[PDB]
Design a binder for this molecule. Structure first.
Ligand code: 4D2
Ligand code: 4D2
Ligand code: CL
Ligand code: CL
Lengths: 148, 148
């Protein structure tokens, strides 16, 4: 459980927002990309795995599950690539609610940033710091408990 | 101490590698940028602070210390912007040695990646996972101890 992440891809202003959620904590990392390609997803995963101990990734769709570049990145980084099928149906709703929450924050900061990518990073900040512990506090505690 | 980061800017293949080091652990985050501008540094700091609890940043040079965009990002993210003057002279050497180590890793992976930005992220991964604890383990423990 401390090593499990879920990929999530949402759309805003004609651009794509790629999100990784740490399932146990609700902590996120996100980036704006022109389009969701295997290459972009692969690069995003390399970044993520160098920063947190990523053991398993539930991919966001079949295309990224199939992509040879995504598979190469998962091999390189020692990540077990799994499907993101919501065998527990509440998983879909939780992800959907997070996407709505994130878009709401983006709208609230949108004026403070010229570029969407900046607004997204502000939204990541606000999400991870929101309290009662924050997602940022929870991910650290979960992982620290695991090491020890 | 758990909230203190140091910025570091090094050069390779005619491009700029911007690095943030968590001083107490040796954990790093890095990005390739065309050139070190206030705007790029500001954006990098927004990303960093959404992901880890950044309380203080020792800026890498006077230009970034002075930059109004960097100051705006530090204000936004609740970061205390400080100088990076090595009042303890061993600080310069430690940073220099890390830059050499990182360039060495980049050279060792350079063949596995078409693009420098990819090689840099692979180097971040290898640095943070290198064991006796790893930098990734140390940053988590330090921060977890602080919350508790
Ligand atoms: C820290 C925040 C409060 C301001 C900072 C500077 N922007 C403005 O002053 C501004 C505000 C409103 C309208 N137009 C500009 C945001 C920022 C930082 C770095 C970047 C950016 C941006 C961006 O504006 O997207 O783009 C890529 O590198
Ligand atoms: C996971 C590694 C092992 C391979 C992966 C794909 N590259 C190759 O197969 C390859 C290797 C050597 C020469 N030409 C191609 C690397 C990668 C992933 C995502 C990206 C990339 C790159 C990149 O190659 O820089 O560029 C931005 O998005
Ligand atoms: Cl790690
Ligand atoms: Cl945080």
């Amino acid at each position: 459980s401390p090593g499990i992440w879920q990929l999530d891809c949402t759309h805003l202003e004609g651009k794509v927002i790629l999100v990784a959620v740490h399932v146990a904590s609700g902590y996120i990392e996100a980036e704006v990309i022109p389009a969701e390609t295997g290459q972009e997803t692969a690069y995003f995963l390399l970044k993520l795995a160098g920063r947190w101990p990523v053991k398993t990734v539930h991919t966001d769709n079949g295309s990224n599950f199939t992509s040879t570049t995504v598979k190469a990145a998962c091999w390189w980084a020692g990540i077990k690539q799994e499907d993101g099928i919501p065998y527990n149906p509440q998983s879909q709703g939780v992800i959907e609610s997070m996407n709505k929450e994130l878009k709401k924050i983006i709208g609230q900061v949108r004026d403070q940033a010229e570029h969407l990518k900046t607004a997204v990073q502000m939204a990541v900040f606000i999400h991870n710091h929101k309290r009662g512990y924050s997602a940022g506090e929870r991910i650290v505690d979960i992982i620290a408990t695991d090491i020890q």
